[PDB]
Design a protein around this ligand. Sequence first.
Ligand SMILES: [Zn+2]
Ligand SMILES: [Zn+2]
Ligand SMILES: [Zn+2]
Ligand SMILES: [Zn+2]
Ligand SMILES: [Zn+2]
Ligand SMILES: [Zn+2]
Length: 287
Amino acid sequence: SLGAYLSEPLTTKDSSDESNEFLASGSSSMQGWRISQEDAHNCILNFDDQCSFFAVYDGHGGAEVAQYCSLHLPTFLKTVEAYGRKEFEKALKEAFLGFDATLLQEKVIEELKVLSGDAEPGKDSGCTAVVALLHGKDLYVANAGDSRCVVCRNGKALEMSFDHKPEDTVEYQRIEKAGGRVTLDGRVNGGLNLSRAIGDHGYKMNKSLPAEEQMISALPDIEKITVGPEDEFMVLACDGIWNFMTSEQVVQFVQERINKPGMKLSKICEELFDHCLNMTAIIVQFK
Ligand SMILES: [Zn+2]
Ligand SMILES: [Zn+2]
Ligand SMILES: [Zn+2]
Ligand SMILES: [Zn+2]
Ligand SMILES: [Zn+2]
Ligand SMILES: [Zn+2]
C-alpha cells in the first residue's frame, strides 16, 4: 500500500500568524526540497497609517522577480504620485507599471542576479502578482496573472480578481494585436503560459506599442469594495490552489474551520494544501 505518496517530493511548510486590533492573518508557503522556490509573498499589517498590504507573487519558474517584488514593490507603491493623493486604484496601476520599468535598470538587474543564485533576469524571468491594499475599510485588489483574491461576503465567495490567462478573450486580443500567438496547450508563442506578469520583458519588446498593450502586460485589473459586517475573511493564493479548487470550495473549506477553538489561520492554509495535494496562501480575517 504506497499509492501516490511514493512520488510526492520532500516538502516543508513555512507558516506564520499575526494580528492587530483590526484584523488577523495567517500564511503558509510550501516548497519542495530539490526544486527551486517560485513563489513569494507579503503580509504587512503596519504598512501605513490605517493601511495593510498583502500579496502573492508567482515566478512560474525562476524565483528572482517574485522575490524582488516581495522585497521592493510595497515600498515602491508608497512613492507613486497617486498614493499620497489617496487615489488607490490609480496608485496601484502606477506602481505595477512603474516597478516593471525598473527591472530594465542596470542596478536593479544586479540585485535580480544575486536573487537568482547568460541569463537575463527580468527579461527571461518574471512573476504574476496579486496585491490587496486595505486603507481603513476600503479594500483595493490589483491582479496581474493567475493567482487570485477571494472575499467571503454574505457567506459566499466573491472574486476580487480577475484571473488572467492567454486563452482568455481580452488577453488573446492583446496578444494577437501585438503579433503573438497562443498554442493549443495555452503558451504565448509556445513559451510562457502567462499573459500578465511583472518582468518577462522578453515578451514586452514591441517598440510600437505602449507598455500596457505588450503581449504580456504588467497592467493589473483593479477592484474595490468597502468591507463591513458581512465580509468575514479574504484569501490570496497562487494557482497551485485554484488549479484544484474553485473559489466557492475554498471559501467553504475556510468556513468549515475558521471559528474552531484553537484553529490558527496558518493551519487552515496547511490543511488546504494537504487536501489539494510551490503552494502559497494567505488568509486575512477582518475584525
Ligand atoms: Zn510571510
Ligand atoms: Zn533590495
Ligand atoms: Zn481577435
Ligand atoms: Zn500559473
Ligand atoms: Zn504557480
Ligand atoms: Zn505557488
